[PDB]
Design a binder for this molecule. Structure first.
Ligand SMILES: CC(C)C[C@H](O)[C@H](O)[C@@H](C[C@H]1CC=CCC1)NC(=O)[C@H](Cc1csc(N)n1)NC(=O)[C@H](Cc1ccccc1)NS(=O)(=O)N1CCOCC1
Length: 333
């Protein structure tokens, strides 16, 4: 099965899922970085403006709903959400699955008022699941219908004409149509985490970063590529970038001349051109241009670690292999 994704300014890739009977529609981000499923709840206090601006699941309108009520809190790198568990059938690209998910009753204005989407569908392992809830992918696999025990991600560059798919997720395989050359895999380090060993990070003619090795979380739910504050501060000064709020910028006229950034993964340099990681929205020296890379200090046992998000995935088609506990990359097309 495939799920069509929408691309909002290269920073938000979301698809749709139906919940309940009849189906209640939601826009969600598919996050390989987490393992729970959640959407805003109709029981969410309207004092939270983000709940006023998003689709809300109403259990009282679903005849397939199954109550549970266990409270859970989901902590993500850029924000937190709180609520309770409920069970109901969920549709994902034609596949129907009974799923335990979180109904959110607390959703902070920042950052959710900036979300064009409603909720989240974690694509991570149960090991990372809060409340020890079974992940939606495991449940689909239990049906023993997917041809393969893997799922692929394709993130298109944002177009100006809404007739080009923003992105695509293939459940149970990959779409040859969106990648060329051969896949190149790297076995996962830790157990139950889409994280792999990174052999090095170079900025031009200097492997000035991650020498001696580091970790890399392949994160579909991340807009930018991220490293530890320390790593970023070093990379950024090597780029002549200045930190504004919590991200970096360069003088637009300087963006095109920025150097290549490479990530050594499983013996294979994955190179990002400046055109690949800078939002070139001008060429003026009188304007600032943002970089799709910022600091993100992820706590142990998963972090410290770099995180490869949409900036990276946009260039390299990614396949997440469950059976072989590995990740594969291939030139996107
Ligand atoms: C084990 C952990 C690391 C996994 C992590 O929890 C998970 O991958 C998901 C959760 C989910 C977080 C919320 C919903 C989708 C995914 N992802 C994140 O939290 C990421 C931050 C991150 C961690 S590592 C990396 N590289 N980037 N968060 C983002 O990329 C946000 C998404 C976003 C949130 C709200 C509105 C609009 C866009 N965009 S953003 O960074 O450019 N910016 C931030 C400030 O507000 C405005 C948007």
């Amino acid at each position: 099965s495939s799920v069509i994704l929408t691309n909002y300014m290269d920073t938000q890739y979301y698809g749709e899922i139906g919940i309940g009977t009849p189906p209640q529609t939601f826009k969600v981000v598919f996050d390989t970085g987490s393992s729970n499923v959640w959407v805003p709840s109709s029981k969410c206090s309207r004092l939270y403006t983000a709940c006023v601006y998003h689709k809300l699941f109403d259990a009282s309108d679903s005849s397939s709903y199954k109550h549970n009520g266990t409270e859970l809190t989901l902590r993500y790198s850029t924000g937190t959400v709180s609520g309770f568990l409920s069970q109901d059938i969920i549709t994902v690209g034609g596949i129907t699955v009974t799923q335990m998910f979180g109904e959110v009753t607390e959703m902070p204005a920042l950052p959710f008022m900036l979300a064009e989407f409603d909720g989240v569908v974690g694509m991570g392992f149960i090991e990372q699941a809060i409340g020890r809830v079974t992940p939606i992918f495991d449940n689909i696999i239990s049906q023993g219908v997917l041809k393969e025990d893997v799922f692929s991600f394709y993130y298109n560059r944002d177009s100006e004409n809404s007739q080009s798919l923003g992105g695509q997720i293939v459940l149970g395989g990959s779409d040859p149509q969106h990648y060329e050359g051969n896949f190149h895999y790297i076995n996962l380090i830790k157990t139950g985490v889409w994280q792999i060993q990174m052999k090095g990070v170079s900025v031009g003619s200097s492997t000035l970063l991650c020498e001696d090795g580091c970790l890399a979380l392949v994160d579909t739910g991340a807009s930018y590529i991220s490293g530890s504050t320390s790593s970023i501060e070093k990379l950024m000064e090597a780029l002549g970038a200045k930190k504004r709020l919590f991200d970096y910028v360069v003088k637009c006229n300087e963006g095109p001349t920025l150097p290549d950034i490479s990530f050594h993964l499983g013996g294979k340099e994955y190179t990002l051109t400046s055109a690949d990681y800078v939002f070139q929205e001008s060429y003026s020296s009188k304007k600032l241009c943002t970089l799709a890379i910022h600091a993100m200090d992820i706590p142990p046992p998963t972090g410290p670690t770099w995180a490869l998000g949409a900036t990276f995935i946009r260039k390299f088609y990614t396949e997440f292999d469950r059976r072989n506990n590995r990740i594969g990359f291939a030139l996107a097309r």
